[PDB]
DNA sequence: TCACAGGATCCTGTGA
DNA sequence: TCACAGGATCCTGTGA
């Protein structure tokens with residue numbers, strides 16, 4: 001139940017409790033997928049979408065690389081737990097070539113495996129005093145053994161077109177919380193998502209949305225109310241982890 | 247790829263993408279140079295010109311000062327993040343003596359490191375609740391290790407005599423935008439620059455001009471059209487950052 | 493004088 | 509108890 005890469009917000013753990021609610025579908029849509037904690041572990045076909053083209057091209061790529069391919073690039077850069085400059089180079093190189101395979105290595109050495117990218121589309125995460133380890137290849141493998149049941153998409157959720165008959169799984173940025181990618185989020189976003197989430201219901205299209213109603217101080221009222229029109233399955237400084245669905 | 251001093255409009259970041267277009271030259275001309283983000287980082291010889299003699303004399307000066315020289319003047323004024331009056335003094339002193347080294351310290355405590363000067367030639371930037379920090383000396387050093395490949399000029403661009411064989415790099419005030427130094431700018435200026443920029447072309451002299459075609463709602467049509475006669479390499483509330491060149 | 497890009501890490505679940 | 513993998517923030521410098 002591993003994700004292809006370590007990823008902030010990943011769901012490895014909750015998938016179990018999360019599948020217990022999944023309806024049937026002709027296509028599984030992972031609207032916001034990042035880590036692929038879900039996609040790599042649901043029943044095909046899977047439309048894995050995420051707005052971050054870098055991470056999505058990185059997947060498209062990975063499909064044909066091999067663990068050796070990977071190991072090679074590392075040896076070639078002589079990267080390791082304390083290789084700060086070797087890192088900074090690999091960064092520059094990515095930034096220039098925009099070669100997906102390189103992003104995949106970097107993510108292994110970033111500060112807390114963060115994959116942060118800027119306006120200009122550059123990888124800017126600071127060194128993280130780390131490199132690959134056991135799970136590295138396990139993650140690597142697991143990806144390669146399951147990605148063939150996936151189709152990758154890199155569109156704003158509001159553009160993925162949902163067909164009638166597929167199941168949509170939403171796990172977007174949590175308003176109240178703050179991971180890096182919340183830079184792509186706002187209330188105006190929480191809104192369109194929630195309104196369109198409605199649309200999908202009227203079209204008799206089943207959906208599943210994981211999020212937090214309260215975390216660390218503030219609360220998501222907009223959804224706290226919206227959440228009524230549909231179900232709920234509370235899961236939780238205490239943050240209330242829920243699964244709002246139909 | 248640091249500039250000698252923090253500076254509004256600086257190009258630290260775009261230099262990379264900007265060098266990828268630089269032609270060959272016997273002399274690099276930095277027509278409008280302020281921050282020295284470019285000059286300090288191109289291949290000598292470099293004719294760094296800027297109209298603001300204060301900032302230019304400040305450089306001519308700096309050539310012989312030492313980080314200690316610098317630190318000294320600070321200690322001597324007991325300046326720091328909250329030293330508002332100590333600041334105001336250092337200001338007066340500059341205003342009176344017109345001693346370049348002092349301007350260099352001030353710039354470190356100005357509101358947003360602005361180096362604003364008036365008709366009477368006085369430093370008038372308000373206190374900025376700040377003083378030196380890490381980058382201060384880095385900036386300081388980088389200047390001192392590269393300035394020897396530079397010749398400083400403080401003339402209106404329309405006078406900086408261009409020789410046949412050098413490359414001219416233009417990055418003047420952006421019409422549509424408004425930094426302090428746009429006080430030296432106008433359409434009549436955009437014009438002379440553009441017309442003379444033509445002249446340089448006819449003389450078979452290569453030139454490079456960074457600017458914005460559109461920012462914050464308005465647009466620079468005069469150049470939007472003029473920009474056709476030559477190349478373009480779009481880089482970008484969205485502002486369109488471009489590099490018009492031959 | 494705040495909005496923003498960008499260098500930074502301990503606290504924690506978990507196999508041993 | 510113990511080592512290791514893994515992350516829904518942090519602070520500081522900076523200003524078209």
Ligand SMILES: Nc1ncnc2c1ncn2[C@@H]1O[C@H](C[C@@H](N)CC[C@H](N)C(=O)O)[C@@H](O)[C@H]1O
Nearest residue numbers: 009010011032033034035036037051156157184
């Ligand atoms: N407008 C948007 N459209 C699509 N994806 C977005 C948007 N804003 C943010 N995201 C992505 O939404 C994701 C949120 C994550 N918590 C998804 C986690 C994922 N299901 C996992 O378990 O690995 C990230 O991968 C973000 O890059």
Ligand SMILES: Nc1ncnc2c1ncn2[C@@H]1O[C@H](C[C@@H](N)CC[C@H](N)C(=O)O)[C@@H](O)[C@H]1O
Nearest residue numbers: 255256257278279280281282283297402403430
């Ligand atoms: N007529 C003029 N002649 C020469 N310089 C001028 C004139 N009007 C304005 N300037 C200067 O042109 C500059 C525009 C700046 N954006 C140059 C930035 C510089 N390339 C840097 O990145 O540090 C300022 O330093 C202004 O002081």
